[PDB]
Amino acid sequence: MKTLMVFDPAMDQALVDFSTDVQWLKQSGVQIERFNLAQQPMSFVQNEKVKAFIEASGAEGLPLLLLDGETVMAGRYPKRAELARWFGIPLDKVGLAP
């Protein structure tokens, strides 16, 4: 299965909504892991792309989202339908309708 790694800022409705959306996606069987600069700081140094991103964009450029190690979004969180697309999950399995 694909894995989404989410590199969050140290720390609003966007965050609340993203937490809700992660819950729907995980329960559809999907792999999502989160890391933030306050609680998992070494993860941001040990991942080559994350370290490069912080250097180029600044920490202010977070969040950074990697899908199987590949950048898929940077600077905002995905809507639930965007998560569904990345993982190939039907909308009706994550509480969404077209």
Listed residue (83, 84, 86, 62) closest to 74, CA to CA: 62
Q: Which residue is it, tokens 């609340």?
A: 16
44 binds a second copy (CB under 8 A): no
Identify the burial level of 21 via C-beta atoms within 10 angstroms of its C-beta, where 0-12 means exposed, 13-18 middle and 19 or more buried: buried
Residue among 60, 90, 97, 98 that touches a second copy (CB under 8 A): 60
72 binds a second copy (CB under 8 A): yes
Q: How far is the CB of 93 from a second copy (least distance, A)?
A: 19
Residues that bind a second copy (CB under 8 A): 52-53, 55-58, 60-61, 67-68, 70-76, 78, 82, 85-86
